[PDB]
């Protein structure tokens, strides 16, 4: 069971002058967004990630090539692959993510819940096995 | 002049693991982001566009390769290419628009103060006009 992730699929308007994908606050996602992020112009063997949240709520969504995500709780790690813009990826609190292979040129946009706070990230394996084990056994 | 546009600059956060751009609604960004849509797959020789708001406050921001965008208000209009992920184009109330010259893998995201309501749109080029010369003349 990979709890608190889900996979979410948004409208695509597409007819001869493209694709359109829009998202709104609290009714494509359930969450209001008080920041977006965007990661590009990653080298193909970088990992990056090494990271859960304890409060924040995230949706990740490649926009443009394709990044595989690594997600792990205590006793459980899967690999997802995001390769199409109508689809996004949430993840909630107290799951590690990493991400790697990152094709040329791979755009992946974030929707977050939260400003930036750097204390409600957890950067330490340790510290993260240790208050996601009481969450998840 | 071409009023009610800017170009805004955002962090990038470069280094060996790639760049990230972060942006808060209200810090980076003058509003509250309620929605953003993106736009993908455009074909070489469409034109997009072709409308102006009312109310709405948006920012337009290319993150892979290159897009153009046709600015116009009554005597006055600015061609404006967007290829970098860290420049918003912030587009105020009753500038026209157009969007062209999408690169291949171009991705277009844009930042929107409000909900899609098909009834800020102004999309009749003789109505803009009409009411565009009653606020900037
Ligand atoms: C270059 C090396 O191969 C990368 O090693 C990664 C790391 C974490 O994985 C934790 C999880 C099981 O995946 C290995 O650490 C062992 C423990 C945590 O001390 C720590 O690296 C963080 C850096 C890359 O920012
Ligand atoms: C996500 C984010 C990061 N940053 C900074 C924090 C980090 O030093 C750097 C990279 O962030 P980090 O979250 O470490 O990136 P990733 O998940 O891709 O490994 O950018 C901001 O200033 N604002 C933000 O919203
Ligand atoms: C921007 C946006 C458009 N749409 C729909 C309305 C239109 O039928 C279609 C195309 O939108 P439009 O804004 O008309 O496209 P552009 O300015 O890129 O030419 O997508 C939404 O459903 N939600 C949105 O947020
Ligand atoms: C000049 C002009 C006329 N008609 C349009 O629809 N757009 C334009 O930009």
Same mark, same amino acid.
Request: with cysteine.
């Given at each position: 069971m990979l709890y608190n992730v889900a996979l979410i699929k948004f409208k695509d308007i597409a007819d001869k002058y493209g694709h359109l994908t829009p998202i709104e606050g609290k009714?494509?996602?359930?969450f209001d967004i008080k920041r977006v992020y965007y990661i590009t112009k990653? =080298?193909?063997?970088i990992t990056r990630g090494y990271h859960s949240h304890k409060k924040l709520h995230q949706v990740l969504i490649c926009l443009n090539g394709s990044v595989k995500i690594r997600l792990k709780i205590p006793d459980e790690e899967k690999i997802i692959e995001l390769n199409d813009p109508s689809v996004g990826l949430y993840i909630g609190p107290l799951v590690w993510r990493e991400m790697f =292979?990152?094709?040329?040129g791979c755009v992946l946009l974030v929707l977050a819940s939260?400003?930036?706070?750097?204390?409600?990230?957890?950067?330490?394996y340790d510290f993260y096995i240790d208050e996601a084990k009481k969450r998840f056994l």
């Amino acid at each position: 069971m990979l709890y608190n992730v889900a996979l979410i699929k948004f409208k695509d308007i597409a007819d001869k002058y493209g694709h359109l994908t829009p998202i709104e606050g609290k009714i494509d996602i359930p969450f209001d967004i008080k920041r977006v992020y965007y990661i590009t112009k990653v =080298d193909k063997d970088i990992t990056r990630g090494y990271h859960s949240h304890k409060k924040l709520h995230q949706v990740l969504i490649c926009l443009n090539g394709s990044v595989k995500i690594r997600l792990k709780i205590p006793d459980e790690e899967k690999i997802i692959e995001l390769n199409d813009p109508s689809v996004g990826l949430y993840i909630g609190p107290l799951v590690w993510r990493e991400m790697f =292979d990152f094709t040329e040129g791979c755009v992946l946009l974030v929707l977050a819940s939260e400003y930036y706070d750097e204390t409600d990230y957890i950067r330490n394996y340790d510290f993260y096995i240790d208050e996601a084990k009481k969450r998840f056994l």
